[PDB]
DNA sequence: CCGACATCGCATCAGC
DNA sequence: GCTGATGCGA
DNA sequence: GTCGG
């Protein structure tokens, strides 16, 4: 499926999704539009009618009508109208700021605050998260080349091992699956001394070392198990400075680590398929555990898991991250 | 016809 | 001051 | 908005 095959339709649908989420506050309509957009992005034919589209799983009566209008007129009256609406287009736009969701964007626009400039003049009304989102607005919308992720990973695995050589850290997300760029870095962390059935500074000490070497530059949120923040690679000589990047780090108990790694590696499609297959073969897989059902349909104890492969074993053949797109 | 549609950790607000 | 709700991101 | 019990 090439971009311009049905790119007009998927852009329209993604645009409609964003308004549902950010303006109408209708999360289930946002997911419906996104799902319609995904199944269409995949369909290897230029769509000629709404009826043709309606066949796809997640395209219903109203999206088929919208496609027809778009097809015959090259636009959509309702999207054209909302696009030109000052209140709505500003609410939608403010939410591109990390930490500003539908509800904060609504309040800001209510009181006349509509642009990054306006937010700039109003630091007093921004929480800590929002100030950082505003501060790195542009950097946060940049993709991360794989080569930079590898440099980031070097730093993270080096500094973790240097804190305590018994830690295990895995960079997951699409980077682990071999993607060519990434949106952020997601690091999963464990230690032999941390299990479900069981100190509480294991995460702090890693975040602390990454700040000591000045890799982590800012903190969005941090508790005993999850850290969310901002990092940057060292600038190499008088060459231009790297953009600031999003990095999350989570500490997972050892006996849940590999269910964690499998999940946060994905992709999403893969996960759903794999959790289907596992139901079908009699076990339940969430992010934490795998458990047997149950003559109808009672889940018993979490089964021991010691690698990713162990999970495949329980349900029957290890697929490497590379081939986990679907 | 009408309810489901990811799920949870952390930060902060609302209520007492 | 504490407890539960909500907003947010992923 | 779409699906399905
Ligand atoms: Na359909
Ligand atoms: Na936002």
Summed up:
The PDB classes it as dna binding protein/dna. The protein has 16 helices and nine strands.
Describe the structure.
It contains 16 helices and 9 strands. The protein is an alpha+beta fold. The chain has 4 domains: 3-85, DNA polymerase beta, N-terminal domain-like (DNA polymerase, domain 1); 86-142, 5' to 3' exonuclease, C-terminal subdomain (DNA polymerase, domain 1, Orthogonal Bundle); 143-263, Beta Polymerase, domain 2 (2-Layer Sandwich), CATH 3.30.460.10; 264-325, no CATH class. Strands 2-4-7-6-5 form a 5-stranded mixed beta sheet, sandwiched between helices. A two-stranded antiparallel ribbon has the order 1-3. Bound molecules: sodium ion (2 copies). The structure holds 3 DNA strands. Mg(2+) 1 binds at residues 184, 186. It comes from Homo sapiens (Human). Keywords: Acetylation, Cytoplasm, DNA damage, DNA repair, DNA replication, DNA synthesis, DNA-binding, DNA-directed DNA polymerase, Isopeptide bond, Lyase, Magnesium, Metal-binding, Methylation, Nucleotidyltransferase, Nucleus, Sodium, Transferase, Ubl conjugation.
């Amino acid at each position: 499926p090439q971009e311009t095959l049905n790119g007009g339709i998927t852009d329209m649908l993604t645009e409609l999704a964003n308004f549902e989420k950010n303006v109408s506050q209708a999360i289930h309509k946002y997911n419906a539009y996104r799902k319609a957009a995904s199944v269409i992005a995949k369909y290897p034919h230029k769509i000629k009618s709404g009826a043709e589209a309606k066949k796809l799983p997640g395209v219903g009566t109203k999206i088929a009508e919208k496609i027809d209008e778009f097809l015959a007129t090259g636009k959509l009256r309702k999207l054209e109208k909302i696009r030109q609406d000052d209140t709505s287009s500003s609410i939608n736009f403010l939410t591109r700021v990390s930490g500003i969701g539908p509800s904060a964007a609504r309040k800001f626009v209510d009181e006349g605050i509509k642009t990054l400039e306006d937010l700039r003049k109003n630091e007093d009304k921004l929480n800590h998260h929002q100030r950082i989102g505003l501060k790195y607005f542009g950097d946060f919308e940049k993709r991360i080349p794989r080569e930079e992720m590898l440099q980031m990973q070097d730093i993270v695995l080096n500094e973790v091992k240097k804190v305590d050589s018994e830690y295990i850290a895995t960079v997951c997300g699409s980077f682990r699956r071999g993607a060519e760029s990434s949106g952020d870095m997601d690091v999963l962390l464990t230690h032999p001394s941390f299990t479900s059935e069981s100190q509480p500074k294991l995460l702090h000490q890693v975040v602390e070392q990454l700040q000591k070497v000045h890799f982590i530059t800012d903190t969005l949120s941090k508790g005993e198990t999850k850290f969310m923040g901002v990092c940057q690679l060292p600038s190499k000589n008088d060459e231009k400075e790297y953009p600031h990047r999003r990095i999350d780090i989570r500490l997972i108990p050892k006996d849940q680590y590999y269910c964690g790694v499998l999940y946060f590696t994905g992709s999403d499609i893969f996960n759903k398929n794999m959790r289907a297959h596992a139901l079908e073969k009699g076990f339940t897989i969430n992010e934490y555990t795998i458990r047997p059902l149950g003559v109808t349909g009672v889940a018993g104890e979490p089964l021991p898991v010691d690698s990713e492969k162990d999970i495949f074993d329980y349900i029957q053949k290890y697929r490497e991250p590379k081939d986990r797109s679907e």
